[PDB]
């Protein structure tokens, strides 16, 4: 089933900050804001961790869209191939989640990659989840849903249970 990262990195503070740094031309900015909150809350409702949104500067989880090289040593690659990536919990790049602007993203009402599903998978990594061997899991390695039992099992193994 689920996997974590080697040495099980995790956020050890009671509160972690996040910022949507950059947006996609495919959607309204408010729509990306709401979908990110919804993705974070799928994981957060299961565990004793709180997310605080910020609008400027460097937050613990930095989220955004970019074309090509974008300051980490993992440049995007144009249309197709890599769609997005994210980093395990830690300082600096740790926690950050990046999306390739050279693809087509949707809120479900048009053609595109389902952004809510994509954001839940990437933010999984940002909180310390690796990839699952369970084909039902959001964390399965390849691309209307909810977290699978296996997703919930893993995140609660890493942080404990909320309730």
């Amino acid at each position: 089933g689920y996997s974590l990262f080697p040495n099980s990195p995790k956020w050890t503070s009671k509160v972690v900050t996040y910022r949507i740094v950059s947006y996609t031309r495919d959607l309204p900015h408010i729509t990306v804001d709401r979908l990110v909150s919804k993705a974070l809350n799928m994981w957060g409702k299961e565990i004793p961790l709180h997310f605080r949104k910020v609008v400027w500067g460097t937050a613990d989880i930095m989220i955004g869209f970019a074309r090509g090289a974008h300051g980490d040593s993992y440049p995007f690659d144009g249309p197709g191939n890599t769609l997005a990536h994210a980093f395990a919990p830690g300082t600096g790049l740790g926690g950050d989640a990046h999306f390739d602007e050279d693809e087509r993203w949707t809120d479900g009402s048009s053609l595109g990659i389902n952004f809510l599903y994509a954001a839940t998978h990437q933010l999984g990594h940002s909180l310390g989840m690796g990839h699952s061997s369970d084909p039902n899991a959001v964390m399965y390695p390849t691309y209307n849903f909810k977290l699978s039992q296996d997703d919930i099992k893993g995140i609660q193994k890493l942080y404990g249970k909320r309730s």
Binding site: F5, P6, Y74, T82, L83, A84, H85, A86, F87, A88, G90, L93, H125, M129, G130, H131
Partner: peptide, 5 residues
């Protein structure tokens, strides 16, 4: 893609 660093 899950990256480490």
């Amino acid at each position: 893609x899950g990256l480490v660093x």
